[PDB]
Amino acid sequence: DDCMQQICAQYVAGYKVLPPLMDVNMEAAYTSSLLGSIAGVG
């Protein structure tokens, strides 16, 4: 929407960027769970 108001990859068409397939919040939840586990594991 911002580009129409003015990334430009979709307008170029050429290449389409692909999402990582994992949400950042889900990855953050995994790291927080690991931080809890390491205190118990050590």
Partner 1 sequence: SFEAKPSGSVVEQECDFSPLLSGTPPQVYNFKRLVFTNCNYNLTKL
- CA 33 → CA 17, 22, 25, 40, 41, distances in Å? 30, 16, 12, 11, 12
Residue 16 engages partner 1 in binding (rule: CB under 8 A): yes
Residues 17-36 that bind partner 1 (CB under 8 A): none
If the CB atoms of residues 1 and 42 are measured against partner 1, the closer one turns out to be: 1
Does 42 participate in binding partner 1 (rule CB under 8 A)? no
| Identified binder of partner 1 from the candidate list 10, 27, 34, 37, rule CB under 8 A | 10
Q: Which amino acid is at 28?
A: A
For the four alpha carbons of 5, 7, 11 and 17, in that order, the dihedral sign comes to negative
Residue ranges binding partner 1 (CB under 8 A): 10, 13, 16
